[PDB]
Structures are given as C-alpha cells and as structure tokens.
Design a protein around this nucleic acid. Structure first.
Ligand SMILES: Nc1nc2c([nH]c(=O)n2[C@@H]2O[C@H](COP(=O)(O)OP(=O)(O)OP(=O)(O)O)[C@@H](O)[C@H]2O)c(=O)[nH]1
Ligand SMILES: [Cl-]
Ligand SMILES: [Mn+2]
Ligand SMILES: [Mn+2]
Ligand SMILES: [Mn+2]
Ligand SMILES: [Mn+2]
Ligand SMILES: [Mn+2]
Ligand code: NA
Ligand code: NA
Ligand code: NA
Length: 326
DNA sequence: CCGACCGCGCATCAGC
DNA sequence: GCTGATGCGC
DNA sequence: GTCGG
C-alpha cells in the first residue's frame, strides 16, 4: 500500500504479458519489479529513483514516471479497451483455462461466463470445476477458517494411519491473515527416497477426506500430488461455507525440510533463493539440495537437518516463514 | 549491445 | 493399447 | 523487461 499504485500497474502488465502476449519472461520481470518495489521503505517519487532498484530498468522507470505524472498509463488503458485482450484476461481466471485455451476460445467466439456454460462439452474436467466454483475460488480464506481446515485435515490423516504427518504450508505457514487456498504437505515413513513400501499412500488420505464430506471435487489426482476442492461443514442451516481450493503433496520423509521450504513460499522468494543457490554452488529443489562443482551436473544430495540447514549451505541468514512472502 | 531467465506433477491429445 | 509433446497450475 | 557478462 506504500506504493500500491505502481505495483498494481506493474501487476496488470505482468498478467497481460502472460495471458495475452504469452511472454512469460516479461511476466516474471514485471513481478520481480513489483516485488522489489513493494519492499521499498521510502515512497517512490521518481522513475529514476526506481531504476536504482534491482529489477527496474529504463522501460519500467518511464512507465513509473508516466504514472506519477498522470495517475494512469496509456499502455494499460488501451489494453483495457481491447475486447479480445480483456476477454482472454477474463477467460484465464477460470482454473484450467490457460493462455492458450483462452485465446482459442476467443477466436471461436467464446468470451463470457455464460459462453463457457453453453459450451460445457468443450471443457475438460479441470475446466468445468473451474467454471463451477468460479466465484468461490476468487474468494480468499480467512486464517480463522484455515485453522478449522488444518485441524479437520490433520486429524483425518491420523485416522487412516497415525504414522501420518501433515504440514499445512504456503500462505498459511507464512502467517498470512487470509489465504487463496490451502497447501498440504504429507509424509509417511514407509515412503522415502530409496523405496515406496506402501501403495495408495496419498489415495487413502484423499479418500478419507471425502468420506467426511470435506473434499468435494478432484482436479488432478496421482500417486504424489492431489489438486481438488474442499469445504468446511456448516450447521443449523447457516449459510454454507464457500468451496476452497486445496493441494495435497505426498513427499519422501527423508526430503521433508527441502519440501517444506519449497511449498512455503513465496514463489518470488523461492525463485530468488534458488537463483542465489547456483550463485554459490548449489541447486535447490522441492526435494533436494545438491552441490555444484564444475561438472554442470548436480552432485549427490546433501544432509539437511533443518530448514535453516539449506540457508546455511548457501550461507544465507535464516529468514522465518513470515518474512519469506515476497 | 546480448542471451538467461526453475522445475515439478498431472492431464490431454496426436501419432503410432 | 502405448509414448511423447504439450498445456496448466504451481 | 532486466541485467550480468
Ligand atoms: N516451482 C514453482 N513453485 C511455485 C510457483 N508458484 C508458486 O506459488 N509455487 C510454490 O507453490 C506453493 C503454493 O502455491 P500457492 O498457489 O498456494 O501460493 P501461496 O500459498 O503463496 O498464496 P495463496 O494460497 O494465498 O494464493 C508456494 O509455496 C510456492 O513455493 C512456481 O511458479 N514455480
Ligand atoms: Cl535482447
Ligand atoms: Mn455470447
Ligand atoms: Mn492462488
Ligand atoms: Mn496457497
Ligand atoms: Mn459454493
Ligand atoms: Mn543441523
Ligand atoms: Na536497475
Ligand atoms: Na487460469
Ligand atoms: Na496451491
């Protein structure tokens, strides 16, 4: 909010390059600039003041100057007028409709929430569920509701097998007041980097959650990752809780801390941390952290006793999950 | 000026 | 039936 | 779009 005017302008330009222009590296450049601006202590009064920041070049600087002088920007304003640009921008809001499927729909004459409803035969399962809970998914979850889901989920996993360990991560683990979805990390001692000694490990947990009438739908489902929809219970005819997105990822137990680091966030923070890993001779992943010599190929995974242990390898001062949201 | 911008799981589909 | 390319969300 | 090289 200190510079929300610039960030919101850089954010919309980021989503325009990703959904319409399909230039993912411009989308990342705008997001990297909007993030480093959102952490700037002083109030931005110059485009030249912004270009000193890492991630803000000349073109964004003049875009910033044009904003501070007028309160608007002609580039973004003309994109808002473009019917096809705004139609693709809206179609991508449906989960499962990416930049390519959205553009194909627009060239076919499908560009509204009803147009998608009339052509439900053209959408796959993930896209229909995204259509079904379009409004519910745009709503975000207060942390108080997240705590109810945390205890619903963490108790349902030990109903199946008390040697289950579920860790709610993501925005919730970063201490956010309200969250877009729920990200669950699940471990079982019979699943490690060397062998899987029990099958249906993730399946048993997903099946139990929907027997309690928690999980309502399934977007993706495999042996390791589950993407679906959940819902809190309601009593005494109170207005039903809105449906929420939930992701469940079963992880090797011996790779727990690198996965907690990878699925805590933020996505911009993990990117900057991973980039600074090769800066010092390591490669950080959702599973491992392998050293880098001169081979150009990663070495064997390193012992990781903590989440701070990964910080220690690249000699980064440990940052609590609350300060990892960038 | 210039190339490098992370890497994973799952679904769908074309081609066989 | 299968494998590979690709889209998608992260 | 940005920046290290
Ligand atoms: N590899 C990779 N991981 C990502 C990306 N984006 C992204 O959010 N993640 C990881 O995915 C985890 C959860 O994704 P998410 O959509 O729930 O984002 P979030 O929890 O930070 O925010 P939110 O749930 O409040 O909307 C994050 O901890 C993050 O590390 C990405 O683009 N690439
Ligand atoms: Cl270039
Ligand atoms: Mn119509
Ligand atoms: Mn989200
Ligand atoms: Mn999340
Ligand atoms: Mn609903
Ligand atoms: Mn240690
Ligand atoms: Na700069
Ligand atoms: Na989408
Ligand atoms: Na997620």
């Amino acid at each position: 909010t200190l510079n929300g005017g610039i960030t919101d302008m850089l954010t919309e330009l980021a989503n325009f390059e990703k959904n319409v222009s399909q230039a993912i590296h411009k989308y990342n450049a705008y997001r990297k600039a909007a993030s480093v601006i959102a952490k700037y202590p002083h109030k931005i009064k110059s485009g030249a003041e912004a270009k000193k920041l890492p991630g803000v070049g000349t073109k964004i600087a003049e875009k910033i100057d044009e904003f501070l002088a007028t309160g608007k920007l002609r580039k973004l304003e003309k994109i808002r007028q473009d019917d096809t640009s705004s139609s693709i921008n809206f179609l991508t809001r449906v989960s499962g409709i990416g930049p390519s499927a959205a553009r194909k729909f627009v060239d076919e004459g499908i560009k509204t929430l009803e147009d998608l409803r009339k052509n439900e035969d053209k959408l796959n399962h993930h896209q229909r569920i995204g259509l079904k809970y379009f409004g519910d998914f745009e709503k975000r979850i207060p942390r108080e509701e997240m705590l109810q889901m945390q205890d619903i989920v963490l108790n349902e996993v030990k109903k199946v097998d008390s040697e289950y360990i579920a860790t709610v991560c993501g925005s919730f683990r970063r201490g956010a007041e309200s969250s877009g979805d729920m990200d669950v990390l699940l471990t079982h001692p019979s699943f490690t980097s060397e062998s899987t000694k029990q099958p249906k490990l993730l399946h048993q947990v997903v099946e139990q959650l929907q027997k309690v009438h928690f999980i309502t739908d399934t977007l993706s489902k495999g042996e390791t990752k589950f993407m679906g929809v959940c819902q809190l219970p309601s009593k005494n005819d109170e207005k039903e809780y809105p449906h929420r997105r939930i992701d469940i990822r079963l992880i090797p137990k011996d790779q727990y801390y690198c996965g907690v680091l990878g699925f805590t966030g933020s996505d911009i923070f993990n990117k900057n941390m991973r980039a600074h890993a090769l800066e010092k001779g390591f490669t950080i992943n959702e599973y491992t952290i392998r050293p880098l010599g001169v081979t150009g190929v990663a070495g064997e995974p390193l012992p990781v006793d903590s989440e701070k242990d990964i910080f220690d390898y690249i000699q980064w001062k440990y940052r609590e999950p609350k300060d990892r949201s960038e």
